A paper describes a structure:
Bromo and extra-terminal (BET) proteins provide a recruitment platform initiated by the recognition of acetylated lysines (Kac) by their tandem bromodomains (BRD, Dhalluin et al., 1999, Jacobson et al., 2000, Owen et al., 2000). BETs, like all of the 42 human BRD-containing proteins, contain additional interaction domains that recruit other proteins to the acetylated protein target, forming complex assemblies and contributing to processes such as chromatin remodeling and transcription. Direct targeting of BET-BRDs by small-molecule inhibitors such as the high-affinity and pan-BET specificity thienodiazepine (+)-JQ1 (hereafter referred to as JQ1) enables their displacement from Kac. Multiple decreased interactors harbor sequences that can directly associate with BET-BRDs in canonical or new BRD-mediated structural binding modes, and we propose that the tandem BRDs present in each BET protein may be capable of simultaneously recruiting both a histone and a second interactor.
Numbering used by the authors:
A (entry chain B): 582 to 592
B (entry chain A): 42 to 168
């Protein structure tokens, strides 16, 4: 998801 | 995506000065913040390309970071302490503007800002 260091976070 | 040019660290058209307050900002304030475990995100301009932040420089029009501040202090770029203090406050505020309130980067910035405030509370009288 958008944001710092969050591209690979999905929940 | 491209990053903007970084903030200038020297400018021949801008008058330069040294004061004991600016020396304190280098030797006490910056030094304390730079060595902190949470300094690393703030030691250079935000790299919006590598961080995949295509909107960073759409939102943040006054970027600032401690690498820039450090160079400014080393270059005697500032006229007075207030200008430097403003750069630190811009840096912290940018982080809070861009990132969500609960984000880890925001907690890092807050830790650094707390220390900043504790040190600037003892900024010496100019002399």
């Amino acid at each position: 998801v958008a944001g710092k260091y969050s591209k690979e976070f999905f929940y | 995506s491209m990053n903007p040019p970084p903030p200038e660290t020297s400018n021949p058209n801008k008058p330069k000065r040294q004061t004991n307050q600016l020396q304190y900002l280098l030797r006490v304030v910056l030094k304390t913040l730079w060595k902190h475990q949470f300094a690393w995100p703030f030691q250079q301009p935000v790299d919006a390309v590598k961080l995949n932040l295509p909107d960073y420089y759409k939102i943040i029009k006054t970027p600032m970071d401690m690498g820039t501040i450090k160079k400014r202090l080393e270059n005697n770029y500032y006229w007075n302490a207030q200008e430097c203090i403003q750069d630190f406050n811009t840096m912290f505020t940018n982080c809070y503007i861009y990132n969500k309130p609960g984000d880890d980067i925001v907690l890092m910035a807050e830790a650094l800002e707390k220390l900043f405030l504790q040190k600037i509370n003892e900024l010496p009288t100019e002399e």
